[PDB]
Write an enzyme that holds these catalytic residues in place. Sequence first.
Site, PDB file in Angstrom:
ATOM      1  N   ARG B 262      25.398  45.085  44.312  1.00 23.62           N
ATOM      2  CA  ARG B 262      24.760  44.428  43.190  1.00 23.62           C
ATOM      3  C   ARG B 262      23.395  43.867  43.552  1.00 23.62           C
ATOM      4  O   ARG B 262      23.245  43.198  44.578  1.00 23.62           O
ATOM      5  CB  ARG B 262      25.660  43.321  42.672  1.00 23.62           C
ATOM      6  CG  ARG B 262      27.042  43.811  42.410  1.00 23.62           C
ATOM      7  CD  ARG B 262      27.687  43.083  41.284  1.00 23.62           C
ATOM      8  NE  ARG B 262      29.072  43.498  41.153  1.00 23.62           N
ATOM      9  CZ  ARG B 262      29.900  43.025  40.234  1.00 23.62           C
ATOM     10  NH1 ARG B 262      29.477  42.128  39.354  1.00 23.62           N
ATOM     11  NH2 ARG B 262      31.149  43.459  40.193  1.00 23.62           N
ATOM     12  N   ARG B 277      28.471  35.265  46.857  1.00 23.77           N
ATOM     13  CA  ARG B 277      27.494  36.026  46.072  1.00 23.77           C
ATOM     14  C   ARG B 277      26.689  36.840  47.081  1.00 23.77           C
ATOM     15  O   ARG B 277      25.812  36.293  47.760  1.00 23.77           O
ATOM     16  CB  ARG B 277      26.550  35.096  45.320  1.00 23.77           C
ATOM     17  CG  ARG B 277      27.114  34.577  44.012  1.00 23.77           C
ATOM     18  CD  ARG B 277      26.263  35.032  42.821  1.00 23.77           C
ATOM     19  NE  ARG B 277      27.088  35.499  41.707  1.00 23.77           N
ATOM     20  CZ  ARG B 277      26.618  35.853  40.511  1.00 23.77           C
ATOM     21  NH1 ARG B 277      25.316  35.793  40.253  1.00 23.77           N
ATOM     22  NH2 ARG B 277      27.453  36.280  39.570  1.00 23.77           N
ATOM     23  N   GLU B 349      35.727  31.626  40.517  1.00 23.27           N
ATOM     24  CA  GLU B 349      36.059  32.994  40.087  1.00 23.27           C
ATOM     25  C   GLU B 349      36.376  33.925  41.266  1.00 23.27           C
ATOM     26  O   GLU B 349      35.568  34.081  42.193  1.00 23.27           O
ATOM     27  CB  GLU B 349      34.890  33.579  39.269  1.00 23.27           C
ATOM     28  CG  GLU B 349      35.080  34.967  38.651  1.00 23.27           C
ATOM     29  CD  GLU B 349      33.881  35.391  37.791  1.00 23.27           C
ATOM     30  OE1 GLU B 349      32.819  34.736  37.882  1.00 23.27           O
ATOM     31  OE2 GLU B 349      33.983  36.385  37.026  1.00 23.27           O
ATOM     32  N   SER B 352      38.556  38.949  37.572  1.00 31.01           N
ATOM     33  CA  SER B 352      38.082  39.018  36.208  1.00 31.01           C
ATOM     34  C   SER B 352      38.743  40.200  35.538  1.00 31.01           C
ATOM     35  O   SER B 352      38.260  41.325  35.606  1.00 31.01           O
ATOM     36  CB  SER B 352      36.562  39.173  36.220  1.00 31.01           C
ATOM     37  OG  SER B 352      36.028  39.199  34.915  1.00 31.01           O
ATOM     38  N   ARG B 391      35.543  37.115  48.667  1.00 35.17           N
ATOM     39  CA  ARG B 391      35.840  35.744  48.245  1.00 35.17           C
ATOM     40  C   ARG B 391      37.255  35.320  48.673  1.00 35.17           C
ATOM     41  O   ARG B 391      37.553  34.129  48.829  1.00 35.17           O
ATOM     42  CB  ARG B 391      35.687  35.615  46.732  1.00 35.17           C
ATOM     43  CG  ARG B 391      34.266  35.838  46.269  1.00 35.17           C
ATOM     44  CD  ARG B 391      34.075  35.591  44.780  1.00 35.17           C
ATOM     45  NE  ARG B 391      32.657  35.553  44.436  1.00 35.17           N
ATOM     46  CZ  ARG B 391      32.183  35.200  43.247  1.00 35.17           C
ATOM     47  NH1 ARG B 391      33.009  34.854  42.275  1.00 35.17           N
ATOM     48  NH2 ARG B 391      30.875  35.191  43.030  1.00 35.17           N
TER      49      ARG B 391
HETATM   50  N1  LIG Z   1      27.605  39.311  44.048  1.00 31.44           N
HETATM   51  C1  LIG Z   1      28.904  39.158  44.307  1.00 31.44           C
HETATM   52  N2  LIG Z   1      29.294  38.948  45.597  1.00 31.44           N
HETATM   53  C2  LIG Z   1      30.612  38.786  45.851  1.00 31.44           C
HETATM   54  N3  LIG Z   1      31.645  38.800  44.994  1.00 31.44           N
HETATM   55  C3  LIG Z   1      31.221  39.013  43.728  1.00 31.44           C
HETATM   56  C4  LIG Z   1      29.912  39.197  43.305  1.00 31.44           C
HETATM   57  N4  LIG Z   1      29.863  39.405  41.934  1.00 31.44           N
HETATM   58  C5  LIG Z   1      31.122  39.341  41.564  1.00 31.44           C
HETATM   59  N5  LIG Z   1      31.995  39.107  42.602  1.00 31.44           N
HETATM   60  C6  LIG Z   1      33.453  38.994  42.602  1.00 31.44           C
HETATM   61  O1  LIG Z   1      33.957  40.164  41.962  1.00 31.44           O
HETATM   62  C7  LIG Z   1      34.707  39.769  40.790  1.00 31.44           C
HETATM   63  C8  LIG Z   1      34.698  40.843  39.740  1.00 31.44           C
HETATM   64  O2  LIG Z   1      33.388  41.087  39.246  1.00 31.44           O
HETATM   65  S1  LIG Z   1      33.044  40.867  37.733  1.00 31.44           S
HETATM   66  O3  LIG Z   1      31.678  41.338  37.513  1.00 31.44           O
HETATM   67  O4  LIG Z   1      33.438  39.544  37.246  1.00 31.44           O
HETATM   68  N6  LIG Z   1      33.941  41.934  36.947  1.00 31.44           N
HETATM   69  C9  LIG Z   1      34.154  43.124  37.503  1.00 31.44           C
HETATM   70  O5  LIG Z   1      33.664  43.444  38.574  1.00 31.44           O
HETATM   71  C10 LIG Z   1      35.004  44.105  36.745  1.00 31.44           C
HETATM   72  N7  LIG Z   1      34.445  45.450  36.893  1.00 31.44           N
HETATM   73  C11 LIG Z   1      36.420  44.027  37.236  1.00 31.44           C
HETATM   74  O6  LIG Z   1      36.514  44.146  38.645  1.00 31.44           O
HETATM   75  C12 LIG Z   1      34.117  38.417  40.426  1.00 31.44           C
HETATM   76  O7  LIG Z   1      35.042  37.695  39.637  1.00 31.44           O
HETATM   77  C13 LIG Z   1      34.004  37.800  41.809  1.00 31.44           C
HETATM   78  O8  LIG Z   1      35.244  37.396  42.355  1.00 31.44           O
END
Ligand SMILES: Nc1ncnc2c1ncn2[C@@H]1O[C@H](COS(=O)(=O)NC(=O)[C@@H](N)CO)[C@@H](O)[C@H]1O
Lengths: 425, 425
Positions: B262, B277, B349, B352, B391
Amino acid sequence: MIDINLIREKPDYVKERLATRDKELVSLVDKVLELDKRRREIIKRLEALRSERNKLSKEIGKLKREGKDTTEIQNRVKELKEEIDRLEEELRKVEEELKNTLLWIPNLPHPSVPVGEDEKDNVEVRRWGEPRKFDFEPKPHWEIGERLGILDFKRGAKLSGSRFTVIAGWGARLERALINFMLDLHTKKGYKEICPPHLVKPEILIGTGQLPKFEEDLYKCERDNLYLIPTAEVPLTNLYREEILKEENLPIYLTAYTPCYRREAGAYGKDIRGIIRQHQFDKVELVKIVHPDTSYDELEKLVKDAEEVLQLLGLPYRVVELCTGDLGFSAAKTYDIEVWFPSQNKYREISSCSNCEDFQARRMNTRFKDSKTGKNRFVHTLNGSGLAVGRTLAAILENYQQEDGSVVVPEVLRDYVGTDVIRPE
Amino acid sequence: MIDINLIREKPDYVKERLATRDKELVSLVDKVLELDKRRREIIKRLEALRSERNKLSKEIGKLKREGKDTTEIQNRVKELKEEIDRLEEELRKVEEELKNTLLWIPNLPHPSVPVGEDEKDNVEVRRWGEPRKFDFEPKPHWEIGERLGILDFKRGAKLSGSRFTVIAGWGARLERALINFMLDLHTKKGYKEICPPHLVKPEILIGTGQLPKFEEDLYKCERDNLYLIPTAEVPLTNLYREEILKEENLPIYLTAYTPCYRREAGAYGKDIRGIIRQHQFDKVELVKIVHPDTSYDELEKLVKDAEEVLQLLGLPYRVVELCTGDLGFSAAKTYDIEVWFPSQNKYREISSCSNCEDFQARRMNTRFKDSKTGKNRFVHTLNGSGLAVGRTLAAILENYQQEDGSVVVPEVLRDYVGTDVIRPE
Ligand SMILES: Nc1ncnc2c1ncn2[C@@H]1O[C@H](COS(=O)(=O)NC(=O)[C@@H](N)CO)[C@@H](O)[C@H]1O
Ligand SMILES: Nc1ncnc2c1ncn2[C@@H]1O[C@H](COS(=O)(=O)NC(=O)[C@@H](N)CO)[C@@H](O)[C@H]1O
């Protein structure tokens, strides 16, 4: 990269060794010499202009006490300083092309390496296992996997284009198994497991050899200026960039699993049907940061660390020492492990273990303060495939296949996978 | 996306639902209607011009049998043919603008969903476990990890910049464990394990919503026109894109572990010191391809499937249903599982799980022939984190920490990892 002094002091030798890789490389030595020459020439020419101007400005200052010479001279000074920068602005520029040129020279192969023009000139060094005899025409890894529904080439392409394959079910469960089996084996032996980033800054790739020569070979996120790694070798080896390690710490053994990403822009038509050449493959690397005096032995050990995976697995193979013409940018000496693929009636690359002496260490700047001399010395790096997962899978699918199509899971992966044989879904 | 009939048949409803997400969305509905109108007009006028033309051409053909009218009419035809092109060439422009416009509207929230503008108006639906109380100030995970030599923030940066962190040794061996523990649980549950490509074609990201709205968020490999996946949700959901599935097969449950990439262009200044993050993180996703009638029950089950992980792990957690103002472009309803972080003295979180009804299925065109009406109907898709591995690692490093700094391996991962407690390396 290699030492500039080594080229200055022994250009003859450098050229004969690069020549065992490609006669077209000899030119690189001439260009660095020519480049190096103009570099030291400008500093001498400048060293003079500097002295003349300084002499004159000194002479137009003592002449301030009335005299008019301050023009036929204040011009010989202005004409003079308008060229010192003209040159400063070329030394800067000449040292740039010097630095780059150097980063384009491959590693000098070790004398022990046999000379050859290409793959046909590689030398077999030892074998293990006897390729299974088939009482039925054995099937290709891609057929046996589609029929089992664990290799989805169609969907892989629907999502990513060619050279992408989704592995599924027992296919995937097995893949993970391999990765786990593999890592545990090597960690138990002493390698430090480590999870590295997969996107990396450019220096990193310049550090290991991938950059600048093979840039067209790597996926790049032009927007963030980060490249996806083609092997765990990159992130792992650069772990100690710009550092001075404690000789007591040495040697440093580390392992890891990472998805590998290669644009494979050269592989045209070659291996277009299975999973032996893909844009993304799983691989468990092996890296060694050691003390120079132990490099070549560590190499031999490393090759055995890899063979063990294959033996433990019951997959027949052979070891090949690559000739000069086949060597590989960073390598100084290297062995390739080739496993048996019944479907192809031949052995094929499943691992590449090489020693890089100080090559990578040099462009990455990783040295050590030794218990002796007390001065800083560049370290030695080694890396090799602790089995590229994908190809092992394919090997497994073919050497353990059955007339009906099922595939018998190797005795040591069972505890990792679940079943002892995975029949048609 | 949603169907355009739903739009023209009850524009009222549509506008009120999007209004719960953002009142600035209501305009989108007007633009698709104003565009659908201009289009329906062109097709009708076209169908007319097309009839008049064929009528006359037929008329100037039977008239070729002696007659000179083929001028005042062979002009009424050229003048007519002259206009049908004009229209086909603007209907095209019209329809492009229409289909991309639609690709920008978010899913309609399910009534059930609570209304609110922010994450602070999301409501708690249940808890589990009680947050361990400490005899000593609990230390943050990055602090504990660096002390244990399992999180190298310095090197992750040396390698790839900020928000990139290397996990080493026990840290790494533990992370792997985590991924295995999780895939084993889910696989046992009935999910199909799959290893997907991490590099994907655009349509696929358009498939699940990530594109077009969030282009700035995904790493792109501009040269090969492929994107790095931000979650296994992408490749897994799009697995059966452009397909007609046999209802007998539904539901389709599948899981997978993949590095998530990301650009996290938004996360600025927030969570700047650990691994909560990052630009790269491990995550075991959970995806469901079900029959419309079972959609929401599957959602409930999905969250339970996820929760299961955190309980076996011994990690206190709380569940929360997100309000429309926080929903997420492709979700129709969605709960987040938030694990307890001592050092932060708060829940965060870690999962999700959402339901997308037919939204995703509509833009990738995945449907099925049902045992009833025989007609084709779009499927319903769901997905949720079967734990973002990163996480979770952070959570167990804090919740299982000790005065001396060692961290206690949770009971169910010790047969995976090795030791029972990982003390200062
Ligand atoms: N940048 C990041 N770094 C680490 N963990 C992250 C990051 N972004 C999201 N997550 C973790 O990944 C989870 C799922 O991401 S989310 O965007 O909420 N939703 C999804 O990814 C959906 N596609 C279901 O998996 C978040 O709730 C969090 O626990
Ligand atoms: N595109 C590809 N798809 C699948 N496997 C590949 C691909 N390219 C190479 N391999 C496998 O990966 C192995 C290691 O790659 S290598 O470039 O030879 N060597 C390295 O990358 C070194 N860092 C040691 O691993 C190869 O020997 C082969 O087994």
